[PDB]
Specification:
part of a larger assembly, 2 chains, A: about 50 residues, mainly alpha, about 40% helix, B: about 170 residues, mainly beta, 4-stranded antiparallel β-sheet, two-stranded antiparallel sheet, 8 strands, about 40% strand, extended, virus, SPO1
Chain lengths: ~50, ~170
């Protein structure tokens, strides 16, 4: 007896935005784009962990 | 039933759709048609048939020894009797409509199928020799250890060499 099975691929995503004036002023904790990217990646990682 | 031959087929034959029993019976019989008023017969015919059979009982028959054996004056032996069934089982692959996982999806189901004769031929009141030869050939071909393969009869056939009629598709 043999069998054949299949699985379907799904998708995930999120969006981050930063305004133009915010990128011009001085920041105390470094660059804002890198911080936003880190936050997005960590949020996605938590969502993946619980969706598994 | 003038003649009766009980043959035992092997596992390969027993697995065929037409052979769904371990024993095949070959017999030759005579048939008559009478007027309803009295026993005035109108025609006589001989029929040769082969059937898958099942066991339905036993009977007492005399013992027939073979050369390396000797028998008592009135020794008897018991042999089974046979009869034509109606349906025989066969296992085929199937699917479970109410499966719960990947371990009980594929199953084997049992289905019962109608039983049909292997051979059915009719001969007229004459040519009893032809019917006897056909019966002997069927028995020998069964004894060869394989299925019944040859059914050709010259009497019931289309004329050979008639090109204007044999050109039509038959594939």
């Amino acid at each position: 007896t043999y069998a054949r099975k299949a699985a379907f691929v799904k998708f995930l995503g999120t969006t981050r935005e930063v305004t133009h004036p915010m990128t011009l002023v001085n920041s105390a904790f470094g660059n804002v784009i890198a911080r936003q990217n880190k936050d997005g990646i960590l949020w996605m990682l938590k969502q993946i962990e619980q969706a598994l | 039933m003038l003649f009766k031959y009980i043959h035992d087929v092997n596992a390969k034959v027993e697995e065929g759709r037409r052979y769904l029993s371990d024993v095949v019976r070959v017999a030759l019989d005579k048939e008559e048609t009478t007027d309803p008023d009295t026993q005035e017969v109108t025609s006589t015919s001989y029929r040769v048939t082969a059937y898958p059979v099942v066991q339905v009982g036993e009977e007492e028959v005399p013992y027939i020894p073979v050369h390396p054996k000797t028998a008592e004056p009135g020794q008897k032996v018991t042999v089974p009797t046979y009869d034509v069934p109606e349906k025989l089982p066969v296992l085929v692959r199937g699917r479970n409509p109410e499966a719960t996982g990947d371990y009980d999806d594929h199953i084997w189901v049992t289905e019962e199928v109608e039983v049909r004769p292997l051979v059915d031929e009719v001969f007229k009141e004459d040519e009893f020799e032809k019917a006897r030869l056909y019966y002997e050939n069927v028995a020998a071909q069964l004894a060869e250890g394989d299925d019944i393969r040859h059914y050709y009869r010259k009497d019931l056939d289309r004329e050979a060499g008639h090109y204007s009629v044999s050109r039509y598709p038959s594939f």
